[PDB]
Amino acid sequence: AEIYNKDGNKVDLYGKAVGLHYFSKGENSYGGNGDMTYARLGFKGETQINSDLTGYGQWEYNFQGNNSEGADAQTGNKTHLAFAGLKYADVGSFDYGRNHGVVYDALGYTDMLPEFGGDTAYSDDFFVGHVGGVATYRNSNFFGLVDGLNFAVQYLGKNERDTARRSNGDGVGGSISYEYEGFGIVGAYGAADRTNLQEAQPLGNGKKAEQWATGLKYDANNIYLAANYGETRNATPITNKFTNTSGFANKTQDVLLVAQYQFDFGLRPSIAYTKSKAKDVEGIGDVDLVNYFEVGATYYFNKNMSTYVDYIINQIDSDNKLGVGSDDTVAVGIVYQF
Amino acid sequence: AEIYNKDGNKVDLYGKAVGLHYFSKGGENSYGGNGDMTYARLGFKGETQINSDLTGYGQWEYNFQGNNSEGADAQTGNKTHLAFAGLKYADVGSFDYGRNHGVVYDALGYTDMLPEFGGDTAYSDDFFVGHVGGVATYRNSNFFGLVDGLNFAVQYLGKNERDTARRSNGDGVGGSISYEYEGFGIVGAYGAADRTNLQEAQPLGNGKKAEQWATGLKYDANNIYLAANYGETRNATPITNKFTNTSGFANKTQDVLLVAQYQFDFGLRPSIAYTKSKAKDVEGIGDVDLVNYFEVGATYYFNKNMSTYVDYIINQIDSDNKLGVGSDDTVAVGIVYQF
Amino acid sequence: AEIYNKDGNKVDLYGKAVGLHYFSKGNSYGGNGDMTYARLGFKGETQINSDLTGYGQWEYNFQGNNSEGADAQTGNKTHLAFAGLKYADVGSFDYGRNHGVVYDALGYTDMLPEFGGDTAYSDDFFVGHVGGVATYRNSNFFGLVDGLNFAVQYLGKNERDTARRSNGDGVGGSISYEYEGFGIVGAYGAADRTNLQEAQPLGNGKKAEQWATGLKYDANNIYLAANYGETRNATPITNKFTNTSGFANKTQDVLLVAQYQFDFGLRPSIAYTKSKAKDVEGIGDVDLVNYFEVGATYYFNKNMSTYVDYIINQIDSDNKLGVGSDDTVAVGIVYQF
Ligand SMILES: [Zn+2]
Ligand SMILES: [Zn+2]
Ligand SMILES: [Zn+2]
């Protein structure tokens, strides 16, 4: 909601209140079971310094509502985004802070399900999700010459945290996308040195991490069809549920398909398929991290209100070598936003 | 404060900064405690008119404690009080899901009107008496627009297997019925739920299910506010033995609250109250008083945005209480800006 | 940003998104790596009557340099939270978490692009942000002397867990006078130290003491300021070799700041800061802070800025207290509203 536009500065305070419940049998399911209510709050501020130069800054927080008021009140509360930047004319834009990864610009094609989906976009995982300390140069329409040809280059700074799961080293990434008449093809790739703490993990053996992904999309006439393929090297985090041993998969092969139609009255049904297969797992060989079919629909009452149901037909085997949940999960959500 | 109203959507960003200090003897053996109690609140109450009959809404609220340092204890007492979204359709009623006030609190709200303290039986994360996560609530006003002033609600409570028994709950259902005429209000609320296994394993109280019910009377007109609550709980009210360092639920509680207030036209509003919560058949102590005091307080409203208040509690708890409940008085002084 | 102003109430929702990186060794002054953070708060004030006004201000810090795991809340805090009243020329009174009265003096030299104001530690009696302070503030001395401002502040005892964040009952004050672009200030405060504070190995006293003075020229796009102050049993000190925490018995604080504001936007800054601790037990006379500062800020407008802040660190490689001896340079790109 645009609350302020005086004297050349625009501030957009926005938020969502998401009443959400997960339904599953009883721990060994896709998403879990119980209350999943959360709220969001953030601002998108932007100042016109002159007709060519734009200054901007964005922050977004997540307040989980499925916690008590004692001890565990702060569980799951994060800062998803926090960055500030400058955009100049047809040259492009530069921002620094906590932002999406340059590979997520590729993975964004298939991340369009009512609640689940886009399972390959792990947070604090190099270039596929949110990540702290990224300097991003972005260019749209290639210096204002070729409409629809957008690219970005992104440098990633080392984060030596106290856990291997959420740490990273110095690295670089980039994305290229061209769109014409509602079509879209994208290519994104990035690499970084694994931190010394990550190297000591039992799972995954390497000196450098790699993520790349490509995408196809048709977005026109109330029809959305999207496909993503990508591979990771020593990047995707994995955890042996049996031994509670964590690390990184040496190689993953990721496929995502999404099919949605948008009706005029508001209902938007969704079918999707996602499979994430890890290879060369230490003492396991190949094991499926993600594998399911999706059937769900989103009803938009308007721009401000929506409800949905998202049913995951989990395809993971009961004897999965890594302890991955095999049960189905269905989510019921009612979302107010401004 | 309504910050946004356009394209059939209204947003009301609200907040308050409450300068608060507790004065007590010492004060671990007092009613409320002692020292700085400054805190801040923030939230939004959004509402969109989908059509002339259907309305969507949502509300969120957070608490930022101001009596903490910038060290390890930075977020000590930071909570999200409310978080839900819902739909209201003509005279059929309203439905929301999220974290909301419990259906028994709708009865408990009659005497929960002291300048600082009060409403002691409305524990947070305690089934139907207070703020609780994962509640689906249906509300009907004026009984489908037929009987103006006759409101009822039904509420489903999902199981929350949390790490502590104090904050856990199982599947439960509750309801409330109230009637209002010319500023008179009578209400009855009740709810029952299955206790979790971790709750059962705790000492103090043996129960298949927890039960909370309460009744309320109030007069709210001509600058006069009178109110009364009576209620009983079964395996619901959390309790702690200070000597033993053991905790659990009281098998039976009996709760009475009385409030008398006059609103002077120039802003001052004095408050007298009485509160007593007795725990019956406590495992290893039998009958023991949880809360017992008299209240004397006054709030001065400068306007709708600024106010100050003093709240003194005449603690009626004997020093020899079996559970170790505080015996000393507590007085609270507050200066509040809000919007 | 004035978010709301109807029927005599004004609310100002404000915030900042600060992209920030520290460049160092890899034992430095400021550190090394991502320092991105966000700020959010409101400054609401209502005109209750013609002569009396009510107000309240809050502010939080959301760190951006953390992950989304266990360390998500690392560095999240409430800086300010208070409410108060202001009556005509009588003055103002507010209670909550606010600035200490010694910071009003320390504010003269706390004006660098990123660092500086080392003496204004958080939760440190009267010298920085502190919780549970009742402050009476009078401007222009009941409207008699233009530019003569003073304040008195009562600090409540805070039985905080650790001695680093604890304090006892105490009183403080500040007096300032300004004339034709010049300004002089004096602030002092004393408080009863906590018993847990007294048990700590470094520092010994029945009460903590802080005072500071300041003079500055702030006109014609020039800013020169100087602060001198001394503390007794108030400044927290820590030995890295021994992992032992306490309070310096005596400190001597000097801060110098020199800036010029170019009309076109650039605003360079040079500064000098030295904090010497006297007779710390086991080490005697040691310094806590010592450096020269070279920095510039570029203000595109009121809402956007970028800066570079380079610290020449004077602390030697063999410092007895283990204070960092490496240099730190900060690069920041700041949007605010
Ligand atoms: Zn995120
Ligand atoms: Zn609550
Ligand atoms: Zn602070």
Residue numbers in the entry:
A (entry chain A): 1 to 26, 29 to 340
B (entry chain B): 1 to 26, 28 to 340
C (entry chain C): 1 to 26, 30 to 340
Question: Which sentences from the paper describe this structure?
Answer:
Herein, we design metalloglycosidases by constructing a hydrolytically active Zn-binding site within a barrel-shaped outer membrane protein OmpF. We supposed that a protein containing a void space, such as β-barrel outer membrane protein F (OmpF), would be suitable for our study; its overall shape resembles the structure of host compounds, such as cyclodextrin, which may provide a structural basis for various functions, including catalysis, by encompassing guest molecules and forming noncovalent interactions. We inspected the constriction zone of OmpF, the narrowest region, approximately halfway inside the barrel-shaped protein. A coordinatively unsaturated mononuclear Zn-binding site, a common catalytic motif in metallohydrolases, was created by placing three metal-coordinating histidines.
